[PDB]
Structures are given as structure tokens and as C-alpha cells.
Write a protein that binds this ligand. Structure first.
Ligand SMILES: O=C(O)CSc1ncnc2c(C3CC3)c(Cl)sc12
Ligand SMILES: *[C@@H]1O[C@H](CO)[C@@H](O)[C@H](O)[C@H]1NC(C)=O
Length: 343
């Protein structure tokens, strides 16, 4: 079990002004720290956020959070479930800001909701430095779905924060799961518009180099992995199903020739965007997240599981390693052409 800590700085809040927080399980024998960002879509105006508050309130408030959570998948402390980092210090950061982890805006007399995702990550890191993180050798910022996009938006800011606080020895790395989306044309006629509205509603922030490329009004581009990734300095391992269900949902895909060609082209486009991503794991499966599922060990690309690829990535961050690959992208063109895809 990971134990809840609400932030001591209670001005860093969930959407409704309740304190944000994190769940922690320490491993005093370990200098590895895994901080995982939960996902769960986002909301982008008063009306859609009010709807989310009625029926997805745990994603907007800490008032009903449980005192503990069980770590699963990459957050598991059992080596059988987590061959990769079972002995690490484990941190689960609940997603309660509805802003893809990008916001820096308080609730106020002008704002019904607070969107503080980027500040929640910063404050979690700051408070963890007093609970052991100051001794870390590696901080892996991981996340799934909106949390995976959150890794992309925030990993270099975590690295800068630790440098400025006087901890240049902590190596900050990112693991972005299911957060690598394409701003493609829908199958029937969108992503970009809702992100553009969201960033304005949230006061959303993006990494500085990407901001400087795209400039004002165009920062929505930095929410798309293939555009933001090249601007990042921290090592980032990208996990993405080639036929991700959330990508298909935004594309209005729910099989005749036009749809067959659409799906094949989507997989080819995704594979193309990962060609120059050296640490990546991209199986040809129709599915959603990977990394906190208890059976995350089961899928393989070219005979290599994700926990193995991640271990190979760790070794590479000590020339390619014999039998220990880190770039694992399926080339077969249709969902479940890889026999290890989830059931
Ligand atoms: O959290 C979850 O379960 C899914 S989050 C999600 N789903 C679909 N598209 C996106 C985007 C881009 C607009 C394309 C983000 Cl940027 S985040 C996200
Ligand atoms: C609490 O967090 C806010 C937002 O980051 C910050 O402005 C303020 O300095 C913090 N308070 C303390 C006491 O550090």
C-alpha cells in the first residue's frame, strides 16, 4: 500500500480548492524514485468541468480520496509483478486538476476552478525532498494517458527545479505511457480545438523550448508528443499502442475499405513519429494504457517485454547493448497482429 499525504502547502489545490496530494511508499534501501502521474481526460470550459464535477469528482477534488492505494504494475513492490523497479520508492500523484498537468491558475473570485497541475508536480517534488528524495540518484517521472502527456509537459521543469534547488546529481527521466497523440483528421468529422480552449481556460504552461518554437497562440502544439519530444533535454521513454483507443475515440472510430485504410494509415503515422525516438515501446494493439496494469509484463515487441526494455534503457543511461534493445516498435499493420496484445 501507498499512503496518502495531502500537500502541506494547501494553496496548491485540486480543481475545487481542496488540497492536492500524493501517495507514497518509501523504500529506504533505494535511491530510485518513481513519480507516477494519473490520467483521465480533462475539461475545458465551465459547463464541461461542472459535468465532470458531478460524476468524476475524484478527478477534481481530494475530499473523498482514500487513505491508501495499492501499487500495481510499475508501481508494484513485488518483483513478480514489477521486474523493473520493484524496490523503488513509489509515488502515485492523483490527477485532480483536469488540465493535462499543465495548469498554473488558482481558484478565485474570477475562476470557479483551480487548474494547478504543473504546480502540483512541483510541490510534490519539493515536499518529497524532505522525505528522502534529496538522496535520490534517479527520479523517473512516469504517467499514463493524460498523465503520459503530463510527463512530456513537465519532465524538463522537474529537472530545472531540482537544479535550481541545489540537487544537480538527481537524474530526472520521463516515461510517457499512452500520451503520444496525433493531431490527425478524424475518420468522420476535435482534439486541437479543445486543447486550444483548455490552455486558455487553465492558464496552461508548456516547456520553454517548445513554447519558443511555436510562440503565442500556438502552444497547443506542445501537447502533441511528436512536436514536444524533440525539444526536451531529459531522457524520455515513450510507450504507445499503435492503435490507441483514446486516439481512435477522438478520431470518431468505433471493416470496409475506407476504415481499413484509415486504421492502417494511423498505425503507419504513429510508427513514423517514433522512428527517431530511441527509447520506445509501441505494440500493434488496440488498447489504452499499459504501465500500472498488473499484467503489464505480458506484452512483447520483437520478443522483448516492456519491463525488459525499461531495464535496457536504465543500462543504456549508465553504443547499443547486445540482446537488450530499447527501440521496440511493431511494424505489422493491423491491431492484434502482435500475438501478445492484451485480451
Ligand atoms: O486520460 C485519458 O484516458 C485520455 S487523455 C487524451 N485522450 C485523447 N487525446 C488527448 C490529447 C490530444 C488531443 C489529442 C491530449 Cl494533449 S491528452 C488526451
Ligand atoms: C505554496 O505554493 C504556491 C504556489 O506554488 C507558492 O506561490 C507559495 O510560495 C507556496 N508557499 C510556501 C510557504 O512555500
Amino acid at each position: 500500500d501507498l499512503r496518502l499525504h495531502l500537500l502541506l502547502n494547501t494553496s496548491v489545490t485540486c480543481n475545487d480548492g481542496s488540497p492536492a496530494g500524493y501517495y507514497l511508499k518509501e523504500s529506504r534501501g533505494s535511491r530510485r524514485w518513481l513519480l507516477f502521474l494519473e490520467g483521465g481526460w480533462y475539461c475545458f470550459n465551465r459547463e464541461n468541468c461542472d459535468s465532470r464535477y458531478d460524476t468524476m469528482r475524484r478527478l477534481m477534488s481530494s475530499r473523498d480520496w482514500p487513505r491508501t492505494r495499492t501499487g500495481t504494475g510499475i508501481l508494484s513492490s513485488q518483483p513478480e509483478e514489477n521486474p523493473y523497479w520493484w524496490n523503488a520508492n513509489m509515488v502515485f500523484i492523483p490527477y485532480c486538476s483536469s488540465d493535462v498537468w499543465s495548469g498554473a491558475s488558482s481558484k478565485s473570485e474570477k475562476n470557479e476552478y483551480a487548474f494547478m497541475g504543473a504546480l502540483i508536480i512541483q510541490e510534490v517534488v519539493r515536499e518529497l525532498l524532505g522525505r528522502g528524495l534529496s538522496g535520490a540518484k534517479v527520479l523517473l517521472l512516469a504517467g499514463s494517458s493524460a498523465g503520459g502527456t503530463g510527463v512530456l509537459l513537465n519532465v524538463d521543469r522537474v529537472a530545472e527545479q531540482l537544479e535550481k534547488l541545489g540537487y544537480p546529481a538527481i537524474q530526472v527521466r520521463g516515461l510517457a505511457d499512452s500520451g503520444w497523440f496525433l493531431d490527425n483528421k478524424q475518420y468522420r468529422h476535435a482534439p486541437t480545438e479543445a486543447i486550444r480552449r483548455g490552455i486558455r481556460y487553465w492558464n496552461g504552461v508548456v516547456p520553454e523550448r517548445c513554447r519558443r518554437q511555436f510562440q503565442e497562440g500556438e502552444e497547443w502544439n506542445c501537447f502533441f508528443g511528436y512536436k514536444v519530444y524533440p525539444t526536451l533535454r531529459s531522457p524520455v521513454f515513450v510507450v504507445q499502442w499503435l492503435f490507441d483507443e483514446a486516439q481512435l475515440t477522438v478520431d470518431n472510430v468505433h471493416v470496409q475499405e475506407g476504415l481499413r485504410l484509415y486504421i492502417q494509415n494511423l498505425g503507419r503515422e504513429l510508427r513514423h513519429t517514433l522512428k527517431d525516438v530511441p527509447a520506445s515501446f509501441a505494440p500493434a494493439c488496440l488498447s489504452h494504457e499499459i504501465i500500472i496494469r498488473s499484467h503489464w509484463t505480458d506484452v512483447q515487441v520483437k520478443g522483448t517485454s516492456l519491463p525488459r526494455a525499461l531495464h535496457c534503457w536504465d543500462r543504456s543511461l549508465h553504443t547499443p547493448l547486445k540482446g537488450c534493445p530499447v527501440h521496440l516498435v511493431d511494424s505489422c499493420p493491423w491491431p492484434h497482429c502482435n500475438p501478445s496484445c492484451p485480451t
